[PDB]
Amino acid sequence: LTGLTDDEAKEFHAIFMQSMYAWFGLVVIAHLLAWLYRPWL
Amino acid sequence: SLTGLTDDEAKEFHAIFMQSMYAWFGLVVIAHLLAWLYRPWL
Amino acid sequence: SLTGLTDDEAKEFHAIFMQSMYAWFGLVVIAHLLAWLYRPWL
Amino acid sequence: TGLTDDEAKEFHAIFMQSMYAWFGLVVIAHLLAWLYRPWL
Amino acid sequence: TGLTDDEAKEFHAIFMQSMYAWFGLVVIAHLLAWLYRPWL
Amino acid sequence: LTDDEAKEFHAIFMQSMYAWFGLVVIAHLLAWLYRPWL
Amino acid sequence: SLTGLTDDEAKEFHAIFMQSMYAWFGLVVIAHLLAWLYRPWL
Amino acid sequence: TGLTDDEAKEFHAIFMQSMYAWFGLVVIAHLLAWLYRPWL
Amino acid sequence: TGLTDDEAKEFHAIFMQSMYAWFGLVVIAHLLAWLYRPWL
Amino acid sequence: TGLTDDEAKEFHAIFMQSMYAWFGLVVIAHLLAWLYRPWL
Amino acid sequence: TGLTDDEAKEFHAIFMQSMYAWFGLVVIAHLLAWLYRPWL
Amino acid sequence: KSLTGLTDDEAKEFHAIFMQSMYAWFGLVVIAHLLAWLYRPWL
Amino acid sequence: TGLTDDEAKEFHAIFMQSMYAWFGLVVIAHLLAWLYRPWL
Amino acid sequence: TGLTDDEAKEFHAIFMQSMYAWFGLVVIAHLLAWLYRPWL
Amino acid sequence: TGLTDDEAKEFHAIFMQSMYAWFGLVVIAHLLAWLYRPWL
Amino acid sequence: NANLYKIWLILDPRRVLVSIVAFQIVLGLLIHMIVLSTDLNWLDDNIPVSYQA
Amino acid sequence: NANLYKIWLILDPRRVLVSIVAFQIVLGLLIHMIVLSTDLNWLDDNIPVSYQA
Amino acid sequence: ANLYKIWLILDPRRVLVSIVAFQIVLGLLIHMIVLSTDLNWLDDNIPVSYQA
Amino acid sequence: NANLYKIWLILDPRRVLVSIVAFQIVLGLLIHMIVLSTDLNWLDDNIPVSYQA
Amino acid sequence: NANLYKIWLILDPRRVLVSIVAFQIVLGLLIHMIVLSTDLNWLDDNIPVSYQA
Amino acid sequence: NANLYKIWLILDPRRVLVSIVAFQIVLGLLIHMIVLSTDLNWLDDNIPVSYQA
Amino acid sequence: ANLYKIWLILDPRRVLVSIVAFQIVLGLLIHMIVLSTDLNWLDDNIPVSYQA
Amino acid sequence: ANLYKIWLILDPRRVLVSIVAFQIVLGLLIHMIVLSTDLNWLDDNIPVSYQA
Amino acid sequence: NANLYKIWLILDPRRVLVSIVAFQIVLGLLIHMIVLSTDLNWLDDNIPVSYQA
Amino acid sequence: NANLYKIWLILDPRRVLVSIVAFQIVLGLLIHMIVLSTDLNWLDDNIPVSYQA
Amino acid sequence: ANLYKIWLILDPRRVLVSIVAFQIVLGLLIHMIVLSTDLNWLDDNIPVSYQA
Amino acid sequence: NANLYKIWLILDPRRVLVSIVAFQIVLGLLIHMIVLSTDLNWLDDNIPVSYQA
Amino acid sequence: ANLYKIWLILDPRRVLVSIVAFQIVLGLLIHMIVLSTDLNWLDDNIPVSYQA
Amino acid sequence: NANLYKIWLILDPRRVLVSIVAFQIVLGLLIHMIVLSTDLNWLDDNIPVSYQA
Amino acid sequence: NANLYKIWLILDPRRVLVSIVAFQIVLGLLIHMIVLSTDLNWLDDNIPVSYQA
């Protein structure tokens, strides 16, 4: 369909998951800092 | 077939679809339980 | 036929459609019973 | 329409049966509504 | 219209019968309405 | 259409028009009997 | 000619047209006489 | 226009006669109007 | 225009005659209007 | 324009004559207007 | 423009003469206007 | 050859006539502005 | 994209280098802005 | 652009000279304006 | 682009030098503006 | 005249019938609306009895 | 004149009939509306009796 | 006697569709018109008023 | 003039007749409307009697 | 009549069914809104009790 | 001049006649309106008598 | 007994898509309608008002 | 002496049509302009007012 | 039923996934706005403490 | 210069003449309006006498 | 397990250009929704008011 | 420079001339209007005498 | 590790022209949002008021 | 640099010249209006003397 | 890095230069307007002296 073999899909999934986890970690750190500064709940 | 999928591909897609849907529903349930613990609405 | 389906495919689709429709109606009935228990309107 | 005689007869029979069932459901609903909130 | 004489005769007969039935229902409904809420 | 078709159509047309006019006249007579306007 | 009609057809059409126009004018005159008898305006 | 000489002569004669008749009718109508409602 | 010399001469003669007649009618009408309702 | 020398000469002569006549009419009209209603 | 040298010379001469005549008329008109209604 | 199709001599002649006309126009403008200043000073 | 492996590698290297430089400039600017006009 | 090396050199020289002359005129005009109506 | 490697080198050198000159002019102008109207 | 039927050799019966039906329906609607707005109104005239009071 | 019928060799009978019918209908509607707006109105004039009172 | 020949001129399907559509639109229009007068059967507080 | 009929060798009779009819009808309507707006009105002038009173 | 089924040799069943479904849905919505706009409303009638209080 | 008729070898007679007729009709309407709007009105000036009073 | 033949008349995919879309739109509409009445459950200060 | 050669450049038909149209429009415009000023001859009650 | 997976032989998986994602995102935004507009608001309710005062 | 006539080997005489005529006419109209809008007006200045009084 | 096959259905490039554009439009929205509330950090006069 | 005339081998003389004349005419009109709108007006300044007396 | 392969999926030029244009439109936004606040540096009469 | 002239092997001289001329004219007009709208105005400032009054 | 010059193997130098020039001009105009709208104005500041008064 998209012209990707099995190995290419495996590699893309691996790097996609790693990058998504790093981005979510940055988001979590920023939200922890915001809660420390200005709690909203 | 209309979608061009065989039987085995349909079975595999259905299995993965159901698993992912159940995980999403579990996350939604947990979030709603937390919201009820914080701010009851009923 | 006008839809390109055979007789057996029609039977199978009708059976699954009826089963799914009955399940959906049961869910709706349960939800409405809960709503009536909480907030009667009539 | 391209239908033959037998297909027309079968379609008419099923159409009549379904229409009668729908009208019966409507009549029951209107009886319940009249029992709850008369309007005339 | 591409209709033969016999087809025209049959269609006219059924059309007349259905129209008479519809008019009968209409006059029955109007009789009931006059019985309930006279307007003249 | 030919001449005979025209003659037949004219006959039926005139008959139907006369029937319609008679119905209209009866309705107007009833309306005058109920609610005169002149 | 321009309309594709011969001489005899033109003569017949003219005769019938004149007859119909005179009848229509007679009806109009009768109606106006009745209206003047009912509601004079001058 | 494609007309010949004789056709032009005939059309001119009939046109003039009809125009004169129309003008006569107009004059009669205006005389009747002046007898009823003078404006000048 | 595709007109020959003789056709142009005839058209000019008739045009001049008709224009003079129209101007005469206009002059008569303006004389009557001045007699009735002077404006200057 | 496709005109030759002689045609241009004739057209110029007639144009000049007509324009002079028109200017003369305009001058006469303006003299009458000044005699009636001076503006300066 | 497709004009030769002689045609350009003739057109320039006539154009200059006509422009000078127009400017002279304008100057005369402005002298009359100043004699009537000075603005400066 | 050239973008506008003119030759060298044609360009020289056009430049000479253009410069002459532009100088004449500027002289007329200067005279008009001197008259305007003599009549209605603005500065 | 039509890029080979080596082109992609060199792309990534100098992309990272220049992005780090831009981050350094932004951080310095924000540090001095905080030194001047604190907002939190 | 289709220009050769020598054409580019000549155009650059003339462009620079003209730009310098324009800037000189601008500077003189701004000096006169400052002498008349200072703004700073 | 279609540029060879050497053309890229030369364009980069000239572009960098011109950009540095432009930034120097900007810095001088901003020093003058700070000397006249300090804003911070 | 006696040859009035020849009008059908000039006009088209189908278009005539369709035009007649449409014109009659529109005219009936228009006349009912016009009479409804005058003093001859029969619906909103409280005869034989007012039902909203 | 005696040759007036030759007008039908110039004008198309069908178009003439259609135009006559349409013009007569529109004129009838227009005159009825115009007379309805004057003091010659026959509907809203309370004659013989007023039915809304 | 020969009225059925009207079906040799008019197409039955178009006639039927037009009849159905016209009847539905007429029914809606007449119900609205009777609703707007004092013959209204909904807002007449008969037999009883339910909002009060 | 004797040779006036040649005007029909330049102007098409059908167009002339159609234009004449249309112009005359429009002019008649216009003049009737103009006269209705003045004090020469014959409908709304209470003559012979006023029917709305 | 006994031959009423022949109505299916004239009308297409698919279009008939689709039209029936769409018309019934639209009619149901319209009638529910019409009943809501009157004094037969069952939502804003404070029965059995008023909950915004 | 004696050759003025040659103007018909330059201008098309039919267009000239049509333009003349149209311009004259429009000018007549315009001038009648202009004189109507001024103090020289002849319709609404109560002469000889006023028919609305 | 022979109702399944409706699937030889109507296309299953279009029917399914229409059903899903209609159900979603109807759910949203009914939720808004119930919100606009006095059966509102969000803005009714039950069990306790949180803005006061 | 060669002014007639102006007809070897300009088309006589366009010149005549433009002249006629421009003269008619100018006449209408000037009549309006003089009619709107103090030189009006229609609304000046001379020789006598006719509406009074 | 035991043959529910056959729903993927008539419905295209890619379109289903794209529609699901878009609908879920739009629904999330809409529900968050709706809860924000009521008295269940958590941002503008001065809890735990007002920060602009 | 002595070669100024070569300006006619660059610009088309017909377009130049048409542009000159149109520009001069428009400029004349504009200047007459502008002088009319000031206190140099010669029409509405009651000189020699006022004709509306 | 076999979730990596989701890239044999969806297109990586369109997925990566859709995540970026959505998260920049979400970021700008969630920052303007918290600036219109009692949590604004720019117009809160803390640490000190600078126009006064 | 000495070769300034070469500017005519890149720029088209006719377009330059047309642009020059159009720009100069528009600039003259604009500057005359601006001078009129200021205190330097020469028409509405009652010099030498006021004629609308 | 193997992140450099992201340039065998995404086109460089469309990306380098997208980073520039976004960072210039963000520059003008984050500067007009800090000028509508109590942090404005131009209309704040510090260091002195020049139009007074 | 010594190879700056090569900028003319990239940019078309004619477009550059036209853009420069147009931009300079527009900028001159804009700056003249901007200075004219401030208190540095030289036309409407009654210096050296007011001419209207 | 040391291979930064290869940036000219993607971006067309002509387009880059045109974009840079246009952006710089627009930014200069915008910044001059923004500084004019604040209290850092140098035209309407009555320094060194007010000239209108």
Ligand code: BCL
């Ligand atoms: C005070 C006023 C009177 C009144 C005075 C009159 C008078 C007077 C007339 C009508 C006529 C009609 N009135 Mg009524 N009418 C009143 C109030 C109503 C009300 C109402 C809700 O109040 C309705 C629905 C009607 C409806 C009707 C129609 C049945 C008919 C116009 C049909 C048409 O346009 O044919 C156009 C359609 C066609 C030509 C299509 C061809 C025929 C088709 C195939 C069948 C048509 C059905 C036919 C009309 C049936 C009529 C037979 C009976 C007389 C009803 N009236 C009140 C009570 N009414 C007219 C009539 O009776 O015509 C016979 C008529 O002259």
Ligand code: BCL
């Ligand atoms: C105070 C005013 C009078 C009045 C004064 C007049 C006068 C005066 C006239 C009419 C005429 C007409 N009036 Mg009336 N009329 C009044 C109020 C009404 C009312 C109403 C509800 O109040 C209605 C519906 C009508 C209707 C009519 C039409 C029958 C007719 C319009 C002719 C037309 O347009 O056809 C034009 C259509 C065509 C030419 C098409 C060709 C022929 C077609 C195929 C058939 C036409 C049918 C024909 C009109 C019927 C004639 C028989 C008449 C009943 C005598 N009148 C009141 C009471 N009325 C006119 C008339 O009688 O014409 C004969 C007429 O001169």
Ligand code: BCL
């Ligand atoms: C005071 C006013 C009365 C009232 C007086 C009347 C009168 C009088 C009539 C109606 C008629 C009707 N009324 Mg009711 N009606 C009232 C209030 C209502 C209310 C409501 C919410 O209050 C509704 C929804 C209706 C609806 C109806 C329809 C059943 C019918 C419209 C016919 C039609 O349009 O089909 C047109 C469609 C077609 C012709 C298509 C062809 C046939 C199709 C395929 C099937 C049609 C089904 C048919 C309508 C069913 C008829 C059975 C009847 C219930 C006996 N009424 C009140 C109580 N009503 C009419 C009627 O009874 O017709 C028989 C009629 O004459």
Ligand code: BCL
């Ligand atoms: C105080 C004002 C006077 C008045 C002062 C004048 C003066 C002055 C003139 C007219 C003229 C006309 N007036 Mg008047 N007129 C008055 C009130 C009216 C009223 C009205 C309802 O009150 C009407 C309808 C008219 C109508 C007319 C036209 C007959 C004519 C303009 C024709 C035209 O435009 O030709 C344009 C059409 C063409 C050129 C087409 C070619 C000719 C065609 C074939 C036939 C045209 C008809 C022709 C005019 C017949 C003239 C015969 C009689 C003299 C009427 N007048 C009042 C009473 N009227 C003008 C006129 O008489 O012209 C001769 C004219 O000079």
Ligand code: BCL
């Ligand atoms: C006083 C009013 C009650 C209330 C009374 C009811 C009643 C009564 C009903 C609902 C129903 C629903 N309510 Mg509720 N509901 C309330 C407030 C809410 C709030 C909120 C923020 O306040 C939300 C988000 C919802 C949301 C919902 C949905 C889960 C559901 C409608 C789904 C739909 O349209 O399917 C349409 C979509 C399809 C047909 C697509 C096919 C199925 C797809 C694949 C999956 C759909 C998810 C399915 C609905 C899951 C339901 C399981 C549980 C019962 C939740 N309600 C309050 C508390 N609500 C209905 C329901 O439960 O349906 C089962 C229902 O009958």
Ligand code: BCL
């Ligand atoms: C205080 C103002 C005076 C007045 C002062 C003047 C002055 C001054 C002039 C006119 C001129 C005209 N006036 Mg005047 N005029 C007055 C009131 C009127 C009234 C009116 C209802 O009050 C009308 C309808 C007119 C109409 C006319 C036209 C006859 C003519 C316009 C020329 C034109 O446009 O042709 C342009 C058309 C063309 C060039 C086309 C080519 C020629 C065509 C084929 C034929 C044209 C016919 C020609 C105009 C007739 C000339 C004879 C004149 C009666 C002397 N005047 C009042 C009384 N009038 C002008 C004139 O007389 O021109 C000779 C003129 O200079």
Ligand code: BCL
């Ligand atoms: C009270 C509110 C707090 C605040 C609380 C938070 C919270 C909580 C969060 C942020 C987040 C962000 N804040 Mg903050 N933030 C505040 C004030 C600001 C102000 C300002 C002028 O007031 C600015 C300019 C910013 C800027 C930012 C962004 C750097 C970021 C938005 C991410 C995004 O949309 O990327 C969208 C673009 C993409 C998704 C592209 C895909 C991935 C790319 C490659 C990574 C993008 C670059 C990344 C964002 C840089 C991170 C470095 C940070 C400086 C830590 N904040 C105030 C002081 N801010 C979010 C964040 O930090 O994300 C990391 C976040 O969760």
Ligand code: BCL
């Ligand atoms: C208080 C303000 C001063 C004033 C201060 C200044 C200052 C400072 C400057 C001007 C400049 C100009 N002023 Mg000034 N100016 C004032 C009021 C005026 C008035 C007026 C009616 O009040 C007018 C018409 C002008 C007109 C002019 C132009 C001559 C010139 C605009 C340059 C341009 O746009 O060309 C741009 C066009 C091009 C680049 C196209 C290329 C070349 C073209 C083909 C020829 C250009 C001709 C050139 C302008 C000639 C100038 C030489 C002389 C020194 C006049 N000023 C008042 C008195 N003015 C500028 C200038 O002198 O430039 C040299 C300038 O720096």
Ligand code: BCL
């Ligand atoms: C308090 C505010 C100060 C002021 C503070 C500043 C500051 C700070 C700066 C300027 C700059 C500029 N100012 Mg300043 N400026 C003031 C008032 C003015 C007034 C006026 C009528 O009041 C004008 C017309 C200007 C105009 C100018 C331009 C010369 C220049 C804009 C750069 C540009 O857009 O080019 C961009 C165009 C390009 C990049 C195209 C490429 C190069 C082209 C081919 C040539 C450009 C010419 C270049 C600008 C010449 C500059 C040399 C001299 C320093 C003048 N200023 C007042 C007095 N101004 C900027 C500057 O000097 O840049 C060097 C700058 O940094």
Ligand SMILES: COC(C)(C)C/C=C/C(C)=C/C=C/C(C)=C/C=C/C(C)=C/C=C/C=C(C)/C=C/C=C(C)/C=C/C=C(C)/C=C/CC(C)(C)OC
């Ligand atoms: C091919 O040629 C052959 C061989 C056949 C020979 C034939 C040659 C012939 C027949 C040649 C004929 C030539 C003719 C007849 C030429 C005529 C030329 C004319 C009449 C020229 C006139 C020119 C006038 C000019 C250019 C005037 C210009 C004035 C200007 C631009 C004034 C501007 C003023 C302004 C903008 C003021 C503004 C301020 C205010 C306030 C007024 O704004 C409203």
Ligand SMILES: [Ca+2]
């Ligand atoms: Ca803060």
Ligand SMILES: [Ca+2]
């Ligand atoms: Ca500051």
